[PDB]
RNA sequence: AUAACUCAAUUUGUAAAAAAGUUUUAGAGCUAGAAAUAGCAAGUUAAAAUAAGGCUAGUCCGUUAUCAACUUGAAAAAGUG
DNA sequence: CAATACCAC
DNA sequence: TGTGGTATTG
DNA sequence: TTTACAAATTGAGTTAT
């Protein structure tokens, strides 16, 4: 009797019930509650609206940061425990004063001066040590016994702010000496062509505060007859961090583009050194050494022969220059600009020195402020130099200290300990302990050190006791933990669900993959009458001769190095492989290079050992654990080999297990899968065939070996948590609708699923791409990540400022004249992304518009596209489409594919929704044990209904109201059921469950013509076989028109408790305001500042009494109280106690109503409001604009055929221009009844009259904006032409306390209305 | 529709770490003047907190997901037009 | 208790 | 961005 | 801001049920 249509979005689920005749029924629904109304008429169409579901990322970032704060605190507690006994003899309360430093003097229990407890000593300390780095350096370099309090503060400061762990190993690299070392190993290889590095100040040039590319050119400028792209220049450039290409240096064909920071350099070098010899390993090792000193020179800035605290010394240099430069700047301003001294040095709000030190000005904002002040004045030459080096008036706690590795704080910590352990025995005994505090990290592969109460933890303990930094290796089972880290995430073999999947790089796995591909190769020669498989002997010979001697095996090699050499074929045709084999024996060749013993690799006896080695190399990343794991095999290899085996690392897992591949055996033959791949008579069955062949027992054993709530099922799907929220809501809507129809199931369910920060990532692509390109375009044309939101400007930079089709530069200032063009035309592929788009002077030069770009263009541009490809400025997908014309372009089969892809949904996520609905609706089986499909689940793409709306003028204008979501679902049901009714053969493509390309292209291109009267077709469409009427153009269109015109549509905004952060994170200064919230129990915000602006979890209706006046007379009240997220647990634990603590007395416990966000209230004249908060309301009504006005607006506005048709539409608009005044009138009466914003309505009416002179198109476009005044939800600002209309807010919830509260079903069809008059 | 492999891109989920920022206190402001006020000096650092907090007391947990109402019902979850 | 401006996120 | 909290203005 | 890891999914290809 009925079908359901569904429109699934990230913020909405539209739904509709339709009958045979495409009508949506209406029904009386009971109304519960305490009001007049007992029932209500409802149309069976509507839409559920909801806020977006969120990813877990923000939550994880706060969670992991929380753990760092508590562990950092524990670092300090460990330090103080070590100091405790001996500090007690020096200063009873030192650690107490530190802990209470934040407290106001009134609240302090000890003296207010932290370090020494009296003014005179506290003042003297700061005079001698103006920064902690003065103290640090003194304690590193001096031999005097030091005060234990100063020792503590120095150590704590290094342990609390300890630097990063991005460099492995130890650190102790002078650019001067390591530059000579580079020249030396260079002239030892090029006797005839030497470099004279005499007089060259390598120190000043390479450690200069400049951009790598410039320093390179500076250095090279001092070497005559040496260009920056020669070998030596490419070495220096490698040490500066650029991307040098040693290809042309060594006359290669494989591009040796190796950069030191890329984590594949280590293997990029051994790849290059395998091509120029091993005499160049000296040179490229000098290169990385020079890089290490250059990197360190950016941080240390001070000669290491004056101090063992180069870092602290560098901070002191910052302080000293800051001091000297400030004295000069003050002097200069006094003399020359006396009227500006106050602004610069006193006004905190003005980004001068005062705002920089006292206000909110960053280093960057401060430089911008005094830049013209320095330029204007005289005698500021060097201050301007330092400003452009970002080196003027620097603080020492700064955003760029993230560069500092922990090894250099450790170096100072260690030196202080060796200095002072001569006087304090406990520092000698605890030296290593203290060093371990700074140095220890929990490995990422161990996770939280939990004891059974963490849903995130996986680590296991070797013994039950508290873990410390010092007993970690003994208490934590690192091996078991590192293994669980991976194995809790990796797949089991689906065919043998108890078996672990093999490492991707397993030797056995790569044998399987090569043999599986090899067995389906066939060949033919002249004589033979038919292509033949390779035999077992031929496959073994090919593996031994080609795959075990070349990392890759090309078809040419197969023809020439096997068929010519072994079979004596001068010509042969190969069928199972293109260009080169996809599979390869990469690991075999990796280990051959490491162990240098082919016989060992080929000996079957060593198979178990080699699998275990690669497993260790895959499972673990830590070199120490790997080495420990490989020790059982130490006797089999040289110590040199073992050391290389350590460094070999692999990642990734296959999809099959060892047992499936080469363990389970066929009963009759006794052969494994791999056995069959190596030799299978003349049938050469591959893995798919073996596993499905009834004459073997593989299929039987897999069946034998085989072994979730609705919410769990959906949560586990792969997809955005945003769409997954719509999926769950869709299932619940369907459940309710089936119940509404008396538990009868629908005939059909038609589902359509809407198709599915970014600035930073765009800059990153271009920065690294242009650098990989060696281009200077970013220095000639600077950008900021915000400008890259312009599609044309982004493409300009992605194309290195060149035309993508012509091999010419473009002009940045002329992008408005240039074209953005789709590589594969958007008539075929509805791809809007950069991945299918291109910037070109004129799209004419693509070639023909009917296809991919022409061969001529591919020939001209392919090499330039290749560089973009290698720079990651274009993508492999984009390159393949750009070059498709040299592979035949778009065949007629390709075209037909694209057209049916526009109509047939293939997204996995939509199939999952269809599966879920299908398996919930269809549960019975027939006499052959086959599922009975009572309900057909149909999936359509949005284009079908979209084209339907346009061809028959059921236009969508989204901003008029939310009805379009529901109309979409109705149209889905109509078009979907009529489609399969007309063409039941199409069920295969649309219904869930189990030469010619021109006809197929024509078919899907004309699939919807049966709705039409001329393209000439009859008035009534029928199914050719059944003789059943599917569409009647004389009354079915009218019915659709009536549905879209219906005013009452069940739009329901999902009410939701608010969760997340307690409040705005801003830590505000102290204020005399009870809105301030304490940051800790005893931190009275009037003294300490705190938070404000908490988020309300939900509101609560309280009917109670409150004390009034001095005498505290009890007065009855009825009000909404907002329960904040922080207050929620306390309020729900005991509501009455919570409320009485707020001041309420004699609360009517049974009358408390929980009111989450968006709770719906109706007042007078159908006026409705939604709860945004405890103190603010949203608009609750929908403006049901008649269809004739919606269609007029779509046409007049040019919101989105033949010229005559366009002329007819244009004449319709002109003949109906009086609709403008009527639409305004409709907005006015709605607003006067429901919006109650008369200042803004008066503004609007005034503005509408102001522009009645404007063209119709423009007035239509701007009337579209006026509906934000009337839209459901939060008031929002909008513009009518050039007048801005500011939002009118509903800043009181009082009126709602005497209105009718409306509780709504998910569909809104079931209501209970509560009259709050009480 | 499905499976293995190749290449590339994207998305989701987890762990371990860095640097800032902010907040209160500590870095004796000095003169003139009864007073506000004026003139000058000065500034770069540190401690502590970084969701209030919780019990399960761990170097753990605290911002995702899920949520009309009513009848039951401790609660889970059923039922209701 | 309006218009309303600014703020974080 | 959008939108609910806040102090300001009156 | 950085490092380490797993899983789908899309989509151009080879072979199959
Ligand atoms: K005190
Ligand atoms: K030169
Ligand atoms: K500042
Ligand atoms: K500040
Ligand atoms: K600071
Ligand atoms: K291939
Ligand atoms: K590994
Ligand atoms: K050995
Ligand atoms: K939530
Ligand atoms: K939320
Ligand atoms: K990720
Ligand atoms: K609801
Ligand atoms: K907000
Ligand atoms: Mg805490
Ligand atoms: Mg700080």
Numbering used by the authors: 4 to 175, 179 to 713, 718 to 766, 775 to 1012, 1030 to 1050, 1059 to 1243, 1247 to 1364
Passage from the reporting paper:
Native SAD (single-wavelength anomalous diffraction) is a de novo macromolecular structure-determination method in which the phase problem is solved by exploiting the anomalous diffraction signal of light atoms present in the crystal. Here, the combined use of these two strategies is described to solve cases of native SAD phasing that were particular challenges: the integral membrane diacylglycerol kinase (DgkA) with a low Bijvoet ratio of 1% and the large 200 kDa complex of the CRISPR-associated endonuclease (Cas9) bound to guide RNA and target DNA crystallized in the low-symmetry space group C2. Here, we present two challenging native SAD cases solved by collecting low-dose data at multiple orientations from three crystals each: the integral membrane diacylglycerol kinase DgkA (Li et al., 2013; 2 × 42 kDa asymmetric unit, space group P212121, 2.6 Å resolution) and the large Cas9–RNA–DNA complex (Anders et al., 2014; 200 kDa asymmetric unit, space group C2, 2.2 Å resolution). Here, we show that multi-crystal averaging of data sets used in conjunction with a low-dose, multi-orientation strategy is beneficial in difficult cases where data from one crystal are insufficient.
The CRISPR-associated protein Cas9 is an RNA-guided endonuclease that has been repurposed for genome editing and gene-expression control. The Cas9–RNA–DNA complex, which crystallizes in the low-symmetry space group C2, was initially solved with SAD phases obtained from selenomethionine and iridium derivatives. For native SAD phasing experiments, we used crystals of the Cas9–sgRNA–target DNA complex in which the complementary DNA strand contains mismatches to the guide RNA at positions 1–3 (see §2.1.2). Substructure determination was only successful using data merged from three crystals collected in multiple orientations. One of the crystals was subsequently used to collect a fluorescence spectrum at an incident energy of 4.1 keV (see §2.2). The spectrum confirmed the presence of K+, which was likely to arise from the crystallization condition (the buffer solution contained 250 mM KCl and 300 mM KSCN). We therefore reassigned six Mg2+ ions as K+ ions and found an additional one. Subsequent refinement of the anomalous scattering contribution f′′, as implemented in phenix.refine, gave f′′(K+) values between 1.58 and 1.72 e, in agreement with the theoretical value of 1.77 e.
